[PDB]
Amino acid sequence: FAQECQNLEVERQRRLERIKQKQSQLQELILQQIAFKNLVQRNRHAEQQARPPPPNSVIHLPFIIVNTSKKTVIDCSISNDKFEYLFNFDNTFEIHDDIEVLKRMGM
C-alpha cells in the first residue's frame, strides 16, 4: 500500500535522528569521565603543593550553579513539609550543572 510507505519514511528519519543523538550523548558521557578523572588528578597535585578547609573554597559534586543579577534578591524558605526547599527570586535566573562547569574549565 501507499501510506505504509509514508509511515516508514517518517519512522526511518525518526530512528536516524534518534540514533544520531544517542551517539552524541554517548561521547559526551565519555568526555564526562575523562573530565572527572583529570579533575581528580588536578586536585591531588594541588594538595601536594599546599589542605583546603571543607565548607569554604570547595564545592563537592554533584552541584548546580544559580546565576542572577546583582540587584536580584534571593530568598530561601523551609516549611513544615519534610525534604523540601524553596528558593525565590524577584527576577530571572539561570541554572548550570557540574558537567558544564567542568567543560568550561577545560577538564
Binding site: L26, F36, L39, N43, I59, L61, P62, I65, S69, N88
Partner: protein, 104 residues
C-alpha cells in the same frame, strides 16, 4: 511499482538501524555504570570538588549561588506565571541536607 520496493528497501534498512540502536543502548547503559563506579571510589570522592576560582573563571560577574545536594535530589522549576511574576526553585532532598555556597 516504484512504491512497493521503496518499501522492501526501507524495510531492509531499519533493521540495521534497529540493531544499531540496540547496540547503542547497551553501550550507553554500561558506560553509565562505569561512570557510577568511578565517582564512588572513596579516594575519588575525596577529590571530586571545585574551587571558587574555577567558578569565577566560567561565570563573568553577577551573583553566583552554588547549591550542593546528594545524588537523586530532585529540582522542580515552575513556569514564570503571575500572581508579580514568580521565579522559584523547588528542591527535594531525601538522602540528606543541602549545602549552599555564596560565590564572590
Amino acid at each position: 511499482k516504484e512504491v512497493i520496493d521503496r518499501l522492501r528497501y526501507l524495510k531492509a534498512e531499519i533493521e540495521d538501524l534497529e540493531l544499531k540502536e540496540r547496540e547503542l543502548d547497551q553501550q550507553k547503559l554500561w558506560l553509565q555504570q562505569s561512570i557510577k563506579n568511578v565517582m564512588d571510589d572513596s579516594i575519588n570522592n575525596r577529590f571530586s570538588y571545585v574551587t571558587h576560582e574555577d567558578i569565577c573563571n566560567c561565570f563573568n560577574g553577577d551573583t553566583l549561588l552554588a547549591i550542593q545536594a546528594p545524588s537523586g535530589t530532585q529540582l522542580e522549576v515552575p513556569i514564570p506565571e503571575m500572581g508579580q511574576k514568580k521565579y522559584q526553585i523547588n528542591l527535594k532532598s531525601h538522602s540528606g541536607p543541602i549545602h549552599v555556597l555564596l560565590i564572590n
